[PDB]
Amino acid sequence: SEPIDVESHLGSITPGSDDIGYAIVWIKDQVNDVKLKVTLANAEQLKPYFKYLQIQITSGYETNSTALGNFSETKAVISLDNPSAVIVLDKEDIAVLYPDKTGYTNTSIWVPGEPDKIIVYNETKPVAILNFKAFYEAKEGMLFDSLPVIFNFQVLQV
Numbered sequence: 001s002e003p004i005d006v007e008s009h010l011g012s013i014t015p016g017s018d019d020i021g022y023a024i025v026w027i028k029d030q031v032n033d034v035k036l037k038v039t040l041a042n043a044e045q046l047k048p049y050f051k052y053l054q055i056q057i058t059s060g061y062e063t064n065s066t067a068l069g070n071f072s073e074t075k076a077v078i079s080l081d082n083p084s085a086v087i088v089l090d091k092e093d094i095a096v097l098y099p100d101k102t103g104y105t106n107t108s109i110w111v112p113g114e115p116d117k118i119i120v121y122n123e124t125k126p127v128a129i130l131n132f133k134a135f136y137e138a139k140e141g142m143l144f145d146s147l148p149v150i151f152n153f154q155v156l157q158v
């Protein structure tokens with residue numbers, strides 16, 4: 001089937017570390033595991049500009065369901081000369097609520113550290129949340145207010 005839909009909530013680099021946002025990976029209910037390629041698509045475009053730039057991909061979510069529990073796992077670090085990474089999402093990466101079972105009553109899943117960014121409320125709708133953090137230094141003489149960050153997402157296997 002077409003097993004995942006990606007919802008991008010990614011920002012730009014604006015200064016040498018900051019959160020760039022997150023992508024929501026909606027996973028269809030029958031899917032056990034997915035191998036994704038995440039690529040810094042505009043890496044070339046940013047090279048003339050940084051002394052280094054590294055993006056750390058972290059799979060993670062928080063919740064008030066005691067049955068599910070919070071989860072966090074670094075998956076990859078990509079950089080300007082190493083712009084793509086293959087990410088496996090399985091087991092704990094795929095948060096699921098079962099509203100009728102104990103430990104899930106009236107519970108929800110949200111972006112880590114952002115309890116107002118509810119992603120799922122009180123339903124069975126499996127999801128993975130990729131959280132993006134950028135580590136960088138501009139080159140000397142390069143000053144900028146913001147620069148774009150373009151990601152591509154490519155399903156390799158399901």
